[PDB]
Amino acid sequence: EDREVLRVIFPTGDSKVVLPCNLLRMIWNAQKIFHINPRLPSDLHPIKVVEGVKELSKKLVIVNGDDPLSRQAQENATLLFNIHLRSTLCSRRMAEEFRLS
């Protein structure tokens, strides 16, 4: 669904975008801090990825409050960053590419 939304937002092919904090660089930083060694099977449970991404998306609030108008505004005001965050902190991508513990 996020893929469909991005294609309608960006008719232009280029994916180059401007976003708040560099997720790939943070992943690389985590790998080098904890000595990941992406040669052994990973320890991270794939469901922890999903249940942590959802919790984090709750944490990042731009529009405060709980009424439907405020929630709709909060969903709209962070939509692009959430799409990027979910599309990079996958379960397949995390288990096969980044091998984070």
Partner 1 sequence: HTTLRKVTANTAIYYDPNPQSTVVAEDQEWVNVISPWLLRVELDRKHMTDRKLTMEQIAEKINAGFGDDLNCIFNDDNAEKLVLRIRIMNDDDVFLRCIESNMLTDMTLQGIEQISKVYMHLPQTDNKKKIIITEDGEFKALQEWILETDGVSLMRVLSEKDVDPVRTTSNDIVEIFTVLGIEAVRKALERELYHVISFDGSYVNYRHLALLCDTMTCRGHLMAIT
Partner 2 sequence: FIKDDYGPESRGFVENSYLAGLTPTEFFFHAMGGREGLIDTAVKTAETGYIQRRLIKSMESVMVKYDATVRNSINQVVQLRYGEDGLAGESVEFQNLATLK
Partner 3 sequence: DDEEETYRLWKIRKTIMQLCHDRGYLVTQDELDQTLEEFKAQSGDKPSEGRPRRTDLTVLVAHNDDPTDQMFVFFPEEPKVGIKTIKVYCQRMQEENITRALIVVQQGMTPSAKQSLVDMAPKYILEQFLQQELLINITEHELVPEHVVMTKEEVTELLARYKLRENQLPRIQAGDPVARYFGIKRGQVVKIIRPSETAGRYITYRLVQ
Binding site for partner 3 (CB under 8 A): 5, 8-10, 17-18, 65, 67, 69-70, 72-73, 76-83
Asked whether the beta carbons of 30 and 100 are under 8 A apart, the reply is yes
Determine whether 15 is exposed, middle or buried from the number of CB atoms within 10 Å of its CB (0-12, 13-18, 19+).
Answer: exposed
Per-residue binding string, partner 2, 39-78, x by CB under 8 A, is -----------------------xx---------x---xx
CB of 23 to partner 3, least distance (A): 16
Q: What angle do CA 37, 43, 46 make, to 5 degrees?
A: 120
Name the DSSP class of 35: T
Q: Which residues bind partner 2 (CB under 8 A)?
A: 2-3, 6-7, 10, 13, 15-24, 62-63, 73, 77-78, 83-84, 87-88, 93
